Enzyme design. Sequence first.
Site, mmCIF file in Angstrom:
data_model
loop_
_atom_site.group_PDB
_atom_site.id
_atom_site.type_symbol
_atom_site.label_atom_id
_atom_site.label_comp_id
_atom_site.label_asym_id
_atom_site.label_seq_id
_atom_site.Cartn_x
_atom_site.Cartn_y
_atom_site.Cartn_z
ATOM 1 N N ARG A 1 6.137 38.263 13.015
ATOM 2 C CA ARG A 1 5.042 39.154 13.384
ATOM 3 C C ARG A 1 5.472 40.111 14.484
ATOM 4 N NH1 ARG A 1 1.691 39.928 9.693
ATOM 5 N NH2 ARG A 1 0.079 40.471 11.222
ATOM 6 N N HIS B 1 -7.177 43.925 13.634
ATOM 7 C CA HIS B 1 -7.671 42.951 14.578
ATOM 8 C C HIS B 1 -6.839 43.172 15.815
ATOM 9 C CE1 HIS B 1 -4.924 39.786 13.031
ATOM 10 N NE2 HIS B 1 -5.312 40.157 11.862
ATOM 11 N N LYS C 1 -9.171 37.289 19.860
ATOM 12 C CA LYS C 1 -8.842 38.686 19.597
ATOM 13 C C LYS C 1 -10.022 39.592 19.902
ATOM 14 C CE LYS C 1 -5.757 37.626 15.684
ATOM 15 N NZ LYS C 1 -4.737 38.667 15.980
ATOM 16 N N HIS D 1 -1.318 34.684 12.704
ATOM 17 C CA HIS D 1 -0.161 34.036 12.100
ATOM 18 C C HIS D 1 0.435 32.993 13.032
ATOM 19 C CE1 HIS D 1 -0.389 37.196 9.077
ATOM 20 N NE2 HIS D 1 0.558 36.578 8.395
ATOM 21 N N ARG E 1 -2.721 46.777 19.780
ATOM 22 C CA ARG E 1 -1.556 46.343 19.037
ATOM 23 C C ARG E 1 -0.301 47.030 19.562
ATOM 24 N NH1 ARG E 1 -1.195 42.074 15.258
ATOM 25 N NH2 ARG E 1 -3.290 41.740 14.407
ATOM 26 N N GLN F 1 0.835 -1.199 0.000
ATOM 27 C CA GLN F 1 0.000 0.000 0.000
ATOM 28 C C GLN F 1 0.869 1.249 0.000
ATOM 29 O OE1 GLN F 1 -3.298 -0.113 -0.563
ATOM 30 N NE2 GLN F 1 -4.420 0.681 1.210
HETATM 31 CA CA CA Z 1 3.918 1.367 1.954
#
Ligand code: CA
Lengths: 590, 590
Positions: free
Chosen positions: A539, A472, A392, A479, A400, A362
């Site tokens: 971020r 937001h 948020k 993120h 922020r 398989q």
């Molecule tokens: Ca396999």
Amino acid sequence: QSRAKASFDTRVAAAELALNRGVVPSFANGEELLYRNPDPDNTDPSFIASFTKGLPHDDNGAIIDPDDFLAFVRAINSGDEKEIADLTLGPARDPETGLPIWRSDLANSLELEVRGWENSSAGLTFDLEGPDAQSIAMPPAPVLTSPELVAEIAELYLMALGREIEFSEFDSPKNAEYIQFAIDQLNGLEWFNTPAKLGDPPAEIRRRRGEVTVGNLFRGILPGSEVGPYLSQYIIVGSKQIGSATVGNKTLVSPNAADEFDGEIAYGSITISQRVRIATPGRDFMTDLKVFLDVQDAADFRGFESYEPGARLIRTIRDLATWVHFDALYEAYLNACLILLANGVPFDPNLPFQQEDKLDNQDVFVNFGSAHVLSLVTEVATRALKAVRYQKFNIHRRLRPEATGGLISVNKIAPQKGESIFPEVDLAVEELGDILEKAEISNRKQNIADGDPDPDPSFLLPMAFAEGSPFHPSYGSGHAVVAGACVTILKAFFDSGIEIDQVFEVDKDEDKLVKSSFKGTLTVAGELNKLADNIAIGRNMAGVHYFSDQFESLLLGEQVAIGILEEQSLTYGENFFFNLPKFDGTTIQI
Amino acid sequence: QSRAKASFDTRVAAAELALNRGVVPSFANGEELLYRNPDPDNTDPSFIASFTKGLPHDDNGAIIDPDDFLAFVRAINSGDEKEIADLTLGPARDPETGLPIWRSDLANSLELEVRGWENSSAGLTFDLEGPDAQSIAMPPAPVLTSPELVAEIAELYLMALGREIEFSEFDSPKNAEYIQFAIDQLNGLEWFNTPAKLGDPPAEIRRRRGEVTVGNLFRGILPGSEVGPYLSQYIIVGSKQIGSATVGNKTLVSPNAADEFDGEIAYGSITISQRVRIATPGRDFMTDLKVFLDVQDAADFRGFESYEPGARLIRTIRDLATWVHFDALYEAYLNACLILLANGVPFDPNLPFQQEDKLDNQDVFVNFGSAHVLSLVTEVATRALKAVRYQKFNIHRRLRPEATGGLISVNKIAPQKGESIFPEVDLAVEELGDILEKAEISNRKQNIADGDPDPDPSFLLPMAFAEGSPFHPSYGSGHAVVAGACVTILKAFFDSGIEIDQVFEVDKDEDKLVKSSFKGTLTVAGELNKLADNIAIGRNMAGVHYFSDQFESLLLGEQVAIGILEEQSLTYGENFFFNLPKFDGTTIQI
Ligand SMILES: [Ca+2]
Ligand SMILES: [Ca+2]
């Protein structure tokens, strides 16, 4: 029974499993109403620590009308289109042209319109697979007066001041002055030097970073993140290209095998270039008070960032910020998955049919194969996004880091004009003396570059993005929640313990990958955690997130991914489980 | 009620929506048992039209033991790991080395192992979102004695002989000889020159193509694929790069804006190159009977294809075959979505919060925005895959076009040696004399190239891939079911009626995108349907699928996507619907 009835029963069993996980109550820090208007005759809340971006603000960065924020919260909780549309977004408009009147001449000359809140009610959205957005809670966000917030602002400002600094050159002499400055400043903060006290909330203990060294500077606390080079392999290295396959005994090498070290991912029969668009070096945003206030008043500055021609592998901090600016939701993880698949990184050994086909008979593509992991890594992202959107908008509404920097800047400027405002960030302002002086110098340079010969002193957090943060609240991070969820999916699905033979760093001089000097071993799990917190601290690097946002939303994403995995495990008749190492060091079998 | 109770009720309502859609019965063509062993003493089914790849075969392409295929079907229906492992996969193994004894010297010299069936029981897997794999049925596949199958294998052989012909040169004099040959050969077939008769099943009527012209040669019948250039824009063109945004009045232009016309999708802050890896032109596979029989006996030839250095935009038919060879599940559609998002193609106007933010006060990222559509287009793919896996393994088990070509080749060679085998493909053999002798010439050139000075005549279908088809029956198609599902998702989510201003085509001479000579207009829906057809027909160009497999699995994928959209619409309290144009020309609101 019937196959349709069995499918319905499996779906109902998954929904029941989600229900029996229970709802973790989501507590905020109480910052929303604890800070009040300084005006003696005004007892209304100031909402300074609350996410108020888009609502009209006075010259000091606070909202003039708290009822605007209350209506915003009501619209968040309801989700109705009309109630959201009835919200006052942006400043007062021109009666004739209908255009919002912007404080900054830049936003006025651009005729900028307002930008709406990004999915204020996506947290009310249900999900058919995985935990409900409101069933999983983050801990309360750090308060403005806490040393945790002070350290988060310090680290944010240090990244903003060190955006043009290469990741491979953190320990290099050329960056040594700034790096030692940042290390000394962070280690001079109660949050970093003083350990967590007994009786503190467990999440605050878990997310409290210790002594800051060059090895862990601007690094996450996920396992495998402080170990090795800064950037994860999956964010800078390519993958085994098409044609480089082992067929029986002979090993064919792809004619484009150099693309693996050129940061080119084998994306099917085409290539994903790991090279990021080069944002203009030294160009920070939202460094002027007027522009910052306009952005807080929903000035649509999206797409106003300038970029250098071409692309390069992530080398500077600004490169990582730019990378996390536009990443298509699950792009980092999807690329990590594509690298792992192309590199032939084995799936989890406890998945079925992973043996040689002479034994199991398989191959795995649809289930327990490449398609399965790609679909899971890309479908966990929107569920994690819904959970983080709930966190948020409906729970924390944390301001922020640009808004915190605005409070800090206004507080620091107030004694210059003889006034005083925002004592809530006084501890941050006094604690971050040299950081704020350097930020003021850089902001003055940026504002002179913007076109002000003699700008007023500004201690605003330099923004890697023209719009700054998205619309937001910062707590949590979309993120970083997607990072947690998708990296959890990859670590469960793949053999996360597999060692990475070749560890690459971006070259110090040329836009290329070189064999990193790291003499230790990197696991797939460690490098995936490094990728997740690379996105998270990218971020942070943009100035759009604090560290606690990133860590707690990474934990939230891991919870989302684990729940999704348990609900999907009911859909397979194969005897198997996912071996998932969690962010806390333990492993859960799914 | 509670939020957890509301989420459980929403998930149960989605499950009830799936259950109430009903299970349309899945009928096969009866080819599994209607073809019998030619030996008078043996009355067992020959299973020649059944997908028998991986089971041992005699020298003529049929399985030696029908009990092996019956055990394979039992393992398909049961899904047990041990029962699948007990299946006899591949030929007899060497007692001393444990390696299977391959007929061809190429597979023996490579020490090739066996490749297992790609998720032979993925159709039994349930799903938490959208229709069950077994709740939706494809119509019976065309039988080997039908004119539909004759036309299918004819266009397959014509694509194989035309793999080196550029899509921009279908109407060019340099390819006019072959194109006119293919057009006259297809129009000489009953399936093409004769319309569907009254009383035929509606699926065969709908999927029956009319007169073959240059403008629709090797093209699908979905609305929007026969009009304009052959390749969809979303498979060749890039997208608006980072920095090419409009900020208020000013319109910033990306320094890398040429990457849009250089086939570079703005994949967040990095780029996806639309340039496909160049498989070695002229090199076809499984043109020799021994290698073909080894592949039918599960010779693991994956990765044995050679590639030219570099990459190029899809120009030749082989380029499309190579592109669909390795595409990461939803890659074509994900790239189409990335192009549509970067190009700023509006979402469906009936989605909420799509107006200007001065009106709705709401961005759309998590819900009804970029993240939503990306997650939907990537999550529909695995559900469509499960449905098509059910169709392949549990219902139809249709032999792959390489197996049909093997039957044709053995049937055509039998009169040379005085025998007569596979009369079931006699109509195909006699209807394709010109095509079959052209394929014999090309196969002789390939076999001389493979290293046989005087190979026996071979009418095998030349395969773009060394392993030929995946280990899965041809009916339906995973690639085309994912195409249908994901293109349906994109057409529902995006404003699919939006007309593309810029229609590009791959340049005849240089690897670049010139303006197409198509004076009409192309829509987003039309180009997404063209992309789905490009993927499906590209699977055909490899020789791994018939046209009807492609079209009916495209319909199955559209059903999967409509089901998932209907389920997920119950998760939103927003007043909205997806305006989804279907492949039948109608529009459904979700
Ligand atoms: Ca396999
Ligand atoms: Ca809007």
